[PDB]
Enzyme design. Structure first.
Site, PDB file in Angstrom:
ATOM      1  N   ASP A   1       5.045  12.548  61.841  1.00 56.26           N
ATOM      2  CA  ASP A   1       4.491  13.236  63.004  1.00 56.26           C
ATOM      3  C   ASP A   1       3.238  12.534  63.528  1.00 56.26           C
ATOM      4  O   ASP A   1       2.673  12.926  64.549  1.00 56.26           O
ATOM      5  CB  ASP A   1       4.213  14.711  62.699  1.00 56.26           C
ATOM      6  CG  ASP A   1       3.074  14.905  61.717  1.00 56.26           C
ATOM      7  OD1 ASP A   1       2.744  13.956  60.978  1.00 56.26           O
ATOM      8  OD2 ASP A   1       2.509  16.017  61.684  1.00 56.26           O
TER       9      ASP A   1
ATOM     10  N   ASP B   1       0.197   9.636  56.487  1.00 53.62           N
ATOM     11  CA  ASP B   1       1.225  10.520  57.028  1.00 53.62           C
ATOM     12  C   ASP B   1       2.540  10.305  56.281  1.00 53.62           C
ATOM     13  O   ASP B   1       2.932   9.167  56.020  1.00 53.62           O
ATOM     14  CB  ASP B   1       1.404  10.247  58.527  1.00 53.62           C
ATOM     15  CG  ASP B   1       2.527  11.063  59.151  1.00 53.62           C
ATOM     16  OD1 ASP B   1       2.878  12.130  58.606  1.00 53.62           O
ATOM     17  OD2 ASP B   1       3.051  10.640  60.203  1.00 53.62           O
TER      18      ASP B   1
ATOM     19  N   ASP C   1     -21.060  22.143  56.574  1.00 58.23           N
ATOM     20  CA  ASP C   1     -21.146  21.683  57.954  1.00 58.23           C
ATOM     21  C   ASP C   1     -22.305  22.355  58.694  1.00 58.23           C
ATOM     22  O   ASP C   1     -22.459  23.578  58.628  1.00 58.23           O
ATOM     23  CB  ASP C   1     -19.816  21.978  58.657  1.00 58.23           C
ATOM     24  CG  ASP C   1     -19.766  21.448  60.074  1.00 58.23           C
ATOM     25  OD1 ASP C   1     -19.641  20.217  60.242  1.00 58.23           O
ATOM     26  OD2 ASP C   1     -19.833  22.266  61.017  1.00 58.23           O
TER      27      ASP C   1
ATOM     28  N   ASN D   1       5.531  12.451  57.016  1.00 55.50           N
ATOM     29  CA  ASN D   1       6.673  13.058  57.695  1.00 55.50           C
ATOM     30  C   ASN D   1       6.853  12.577  59.133  1.00 55.50           C
ATOM     31  O   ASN D   1       7.589  13.185  59.911  1.00 55.50           O
ATOM     32  CB  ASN D   1       6.605  14.587  57.634  1.00 55.50           C
ATOM     33  CG  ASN D   1       5.457  15.150  58.438  1.00 55.50           C
ATOM     34  OD1 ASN D   1       4.500  14.445  58.748  1.00 55.50           O
ATOM     35  ND2 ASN D   1       5.542  16.432  58.777  1.00 55.50           N
TER      36      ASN D   1
ATOM     37  N   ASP E   1      -1.534  13.980  56.069  1.00 55.28           N
ATOM     38  CA  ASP E   1      -1.264  15.263  55.438  1.00 55.28           C
ATOM     39  C   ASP E   1      -1.608  15.243  53.948  1.00 55.28           C
ATOM     40  O   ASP E   1      -2.064  14.227  53.419  1.00 55.28           O
ATOM     41  CB  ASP E   1       0.205  15.639  55.638  1.00 55.28           C
ATOM     42  CG  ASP E   1       1.144  14.484  55.343  1.00 55.28           C
ATOM     43  OD1 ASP E   1       1.276  14.108  54.159  1.00 55.28           O
ATOM     44  OD2 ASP E   1       1.749  13.949  56.295  1.00 55.28           O
TER      45      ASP E   1
ATOM     46  N   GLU F   1     -24.858  19.264  55.369  1.00 54.20           N
ATOM     47  CA  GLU F   1     -25.038  18.453  56.562  1.00 54.20           C
ATOM     48  C   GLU F   1     -26.247  19.002  57.292  1.00 54.20           C
ATOM     49  O   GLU F   1     -26.145  19.989  58.023  1.00 54.20           O
ATOM     50  CB  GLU F   1     -23.812  18.510  57.474  1.00 54.20           C
ATOM     51  CG  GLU F   1     -23.940  17.603  58.694  1.00 54.20           C
ATOM     52  CD  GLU F   1     -22.856  17.839  59.731  1.00 54.20           C
ATOM     53  OE1 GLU F   1     -22.347  16.841  60.288  1.00 54.20           O
ATOM     54  OE2 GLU F   1     -22.523  19.016  59.995  1.00 54.20           O
TER      55      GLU F   1
HETATM   56 CA   LIG Z   1       2.146  14.381  58.712  1.00 53.59          CA
END
Ligand SMILES: [Ca+2]
Length: 555
Positions: free
Chosen positions: A24, A20, A198, A22, A28, A252
């Protein structure tokens, strides 16, 4: 000639829990891009990322509301392009997740579809009248309750094998298929090197939707893979899409018997390149997918034997000990107790990187990350366990305590705790509050501590990757289990071009002995873990420490 992907080492990134940038609390694109040097230094050739498209995140990416937009949490399309470019600068390849058995209920196709009975998107999904005051049939969902959900707008039910907010796409509708093909081209045109499909075996539905028999009901996953047009659709997708690109495809294959697998991966059939099967990773899971069943190394190796066999001459397997839907490799297959964690983790690394097939390393396993010490109900938060409560607790089949006791060992969240980068706040994953709690053991299990330590799990992974890269037999070589019945020591050979290698792994926390097959002798020792001394040249046997692993060239 063998394609690049047969000798490649893949790394699975779960972007939500990787890095991460930022605060939050959610990983990302910028986070992944910052860490490419780390993955490159590890020796990673290619990365499979879990879904990164627009999503309400009822299933963390697997409910896609727009296939041509990136997920808001992960960043922008520009961030994706930058990720692509930075991977290319390092000569690395990207495999994306393709979720086209179903979409989000927030996808514009479904919003249009559900609005009336007479719109051009109605048959993008499956709408059916109920019968006898109930659902169209007895189809249960993998994520709780019926696989049919009634819509008061039209009074009909729509089909969802998984989440109620994951309605299944209708592959029987040619227009829908063409939309999916155009969608795939959109990403392939951007230079995507790989696609993981998937639940690829459930695309085709059974005409008329007749009820499942009681026998079928016991393992309804199998029936959902018995769609009559399944391979017809996969072949069409290859013809219209993959045949025009140089991308590797992986499936999958969930719910399908192992004997059906060659139909997906036989290169001559022009369907998929590689198989993700459930046989090994769920070899100790009960039919309900949450109970555990005791198994031994004998069960373990025999499953691998069976999986390797169906690959045959023209097919190809992936190999993994962990993914985003399973307990941590070392907790699951090894011994995650503090005194055995590193030794067993190295032993599993040796296994992973010497299997026939394309190995996939799940993020954090190279650090020897373990299962999370679940405490609160909130720790378990996940759509699948939520479904287990609906199907097993609300129905009085089990108590909440019983469910959580077992799910603690099998929870998908075990694999989804923030990657442990250093010993700073939240293991250096985020500056804010992580969407899922960091494992407390990050203080001794983190990337920073292991990079600098040549004796670490990381360094062992890195050395194994290097060795596999320099040794063709360890990738595309033949495979032979020395003793499928042995439950103490895992031993097998890999051979190619007259060169034969021996892999020996002690799965016990006790000293064990191993005798080489008649006429086989150690020539060289490539590498060992938890061994005080390499065998002498010409040795006909080995003395193994607890959890000792080793790769030897033989003569
Ligand atoms: Ca983030």
């Amino acid at each position: 000639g063998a394609p690049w992907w047969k000798s490649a080492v893949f790394y699975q990134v779960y972007p939500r829990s990787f890095k991460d940038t930022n605060g939050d609390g959610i990983g990302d694109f910028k986070g992944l891009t910052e860490k490419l040097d780390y993955l490159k230094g590890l020796g990673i050739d290619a990365i499979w990322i879990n879904p990164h498209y627009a999503s309400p995140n009822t299933d963390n990416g697997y409910d896609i509301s727009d296939y041509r937009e990136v997920m808001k949490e992960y960043g922008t399309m520009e961030d994706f392009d930058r990720l692509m470019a930075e991977l290319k600068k390092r000569g690395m390849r990207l495999m994306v997740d393709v979720v086209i058995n179903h979409s989000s209920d927030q996808h514009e196709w479904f919003k249009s579809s559900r609005a009336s009975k007479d719109n051009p998107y109605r048959d993008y999904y499956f709408w059916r009248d109920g019968k006898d005051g109930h659902e169209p049939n007895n189809y249960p969902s993998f994520f709780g309750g019926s696989a049919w959900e009634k819509d008061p707008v039209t009074g009909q039910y729509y089909l969802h094998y998984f989440g109620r907010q994951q309605p299944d796409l209708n592959w029987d509708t040619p227009k829908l298929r063409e939309e999916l093909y155009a969608m795939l081209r959109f990403w392939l045109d951007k230079g995507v090197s790989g696609m993981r499909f998937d639940t690829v075996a459930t695309y085709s539905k059974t005409p008329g939707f007749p009820d499942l028999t009681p026998e079928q009901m016991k393992n309804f996953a199998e029936a959902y893979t018995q769609g009559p047009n399944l391979h017809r659709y996969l072949q069409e997708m290859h013809e219209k899409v993959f045949d025009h690109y140089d991308a590797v495809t992986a499936g999958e294959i969930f719910g399908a018997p192992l004997n059906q697998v060659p139909l997906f991966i036989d290169s001559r059939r022009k369907e998929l390149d590689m198989a993700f099967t459930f046989d090994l990773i769920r070899y100790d899971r009960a039919l309900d997918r949450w109970h555990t069943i005791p198994r031994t190394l004998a069960d373990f190796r025999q499953t691998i034997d069976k999986v390797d066999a169906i690959a045959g001459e023209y097919g190809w397997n992936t190999f993994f000990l962990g993914n985003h839907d399973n307990p941590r490799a070392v907790s699951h297959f090894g011994d995650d107790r503090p005194q055995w964690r590193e030794a067993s983790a190295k032993a599993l690394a040796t296994v992973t990187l010497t299997q026939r097939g394309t190995p996939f390393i799940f993020q954090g396993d190279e650090l020897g990350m373990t299962n999370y010490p679940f405490k609160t109900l909130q720790d378990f938060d996940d759509i699948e366990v939520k479904g287990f409560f609906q199907d097993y607790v609300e129905t009085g089949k089990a108590t909440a305590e019983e469910l959580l006791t077992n799910v603690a060992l099998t929870s998908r969240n075990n694999a989804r705790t923030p990657f442990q980068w250093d010993d700073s706040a939240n293991a250096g994953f985020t500056t804010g509050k992580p969407w899922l709690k960091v494992n407390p053991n990050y203080t001794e299990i983190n990337a920073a501590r292991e990079i600098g330590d040549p004796k670490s799990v990381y360094s062992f992974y890195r050395n194994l990757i290097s060795i596999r890269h320099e040794t063709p037999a360890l990738s595309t070589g033949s495979y032979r289990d020395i003793d499928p019945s042995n439950a103490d020591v895992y031993a097998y050979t890999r051979s190619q071009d007259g060169e034969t290698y021996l892999v020996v792994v002690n799965f016990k926390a006790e000293p064990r002995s191993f005798t080489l097959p008649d006429g086989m002798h150690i020539a060289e020792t490539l590498i060992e873990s938890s061994s005080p001394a390499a065998p002498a040249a010409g040795a006909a046997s080995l003395e193994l420490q607890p959890w000792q692993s080793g790769i030897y060239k033989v003569k």
